[PDB]
Amino acid sequence: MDRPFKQRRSFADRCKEVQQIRDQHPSKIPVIIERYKGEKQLPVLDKTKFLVPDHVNMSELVKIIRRRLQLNPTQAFFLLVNQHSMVSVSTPIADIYEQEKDEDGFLYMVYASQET
Numbered sequence: 001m002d003r004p005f006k007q008r009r010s011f012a013d014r015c016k017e018v019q020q021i022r023d024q025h026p027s028k029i030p031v032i033i034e035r036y037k038g039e040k041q042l043p044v045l046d047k048t049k050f051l052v053p054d055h056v057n058m059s060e061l062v063k064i065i066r067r068r069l070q071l072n073p074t075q076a077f078f079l080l081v082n083q084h085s086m087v088s089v090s091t092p093i094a095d096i097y098e099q100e101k102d103e104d105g106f107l108y109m110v111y112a113s114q115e116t
């Protein structure tokens with residue numbers, strides 16, 4: 001629906017789903033990508049739950065998500081993980097998953113037209 005993921009799924013069920021994904025997609029990182037609650041410029045992505053092959057750099061994900069949003073060339077766009085902008089993080093998602101993942105095992109990201 002429209003409510004954020006953590007509002008729709010219990011912590012238990014989210015954990016259980018991450019365990020399922022470890023069995024069924026071992027090389028992928030499970031991620032939740034959501035629009036900032038107070039965002040007024042950027043549109044809402046078609047979907048919010050993704051798997052990411054774990055070699056993809058965070059910096060590349062910024063470019064991929066920006067393409068998916070179909071913005072104009074000048075629109076501001078920031079992808080935030082635990083409030084940090086990912087635009088210059090040329091590090092595989094595998095290597096930041098363990099430091100930045102939620103207790104439920106998903107890696108959460110927020111996009112917005114401003115950083116702070």
Ligand SMILES: CO[C@@H]1[C@@H](OC(N)=O)[C@@H](O)[C@H](Oc2ccc3c(O)c(NC(=O)c4ccc(O)c(CC=C(C)C)c4)c(=O)oc3c2C)OC1(C)C
Nearest residue numbers: 017020021024025028049050051052053056061064065068
């Ligand atoms: C509980 O798992 C479910 C799946 O259930 C089962 N039995 O497999 C199924 O219901 C659905 O399956 C999905 C759902 C989403 C993706 C998915 O989003 C994938 N990602 C890519 O193909 C991909 C490849 C390259 C790349 O740079 C990016 C990043 C894309 C950005 C975030 C827009 C993504 C993928 O490989 O597999 C996916 C699969 C198998 O969603 C899950 C994982 C929650």
